[PDB]
């Protein structure tokens, strides 16, 4: 599908509200495997299971290993911009 830019708002007491799988060491993108109900990704409205996370706040995640992506994603705070695509 089309590449999309999606905005997510989150306080500091919460996580993103997603589960991710995949990563460069597995030969696949960072993929959203769960959107947890009522948490920030769900509330944002624009992120869905099956989306590949291409970048977050301008940080490319297309060639990142799983745990690299966890560190990068969990560091983001407040108003967080995602670039995603559903294939």
């Amino acid at each position: 599908g089309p590449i999309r830019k999606v905005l997510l708002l989150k306080e500091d007491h919460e996580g993103l509200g997603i589960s991710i799988t995949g990563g460069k060491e597995h030969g696949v993108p960072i993929l959203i495997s769960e959107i947890h109900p009522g948490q920030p990704a769900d509330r944002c409205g624009g992120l869905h299971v099956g989306d590949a996370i291409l970048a977050v706040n301008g940080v490319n995640l297309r060639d990142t290993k799983h745990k690299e992506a966890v560190t990068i994603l969990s560091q983001q705070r407040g108003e967080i911009e995602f670039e995603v695509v559903y294939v």
Binding site: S19, T21, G23, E34, H66
Partner: peptide
């Protein structure tokens, strides 16, 4: 086969 992390 792939890992999953809740974040």
């Amino acid at each position: 086969r792939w890992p999953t992390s809740k974040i």
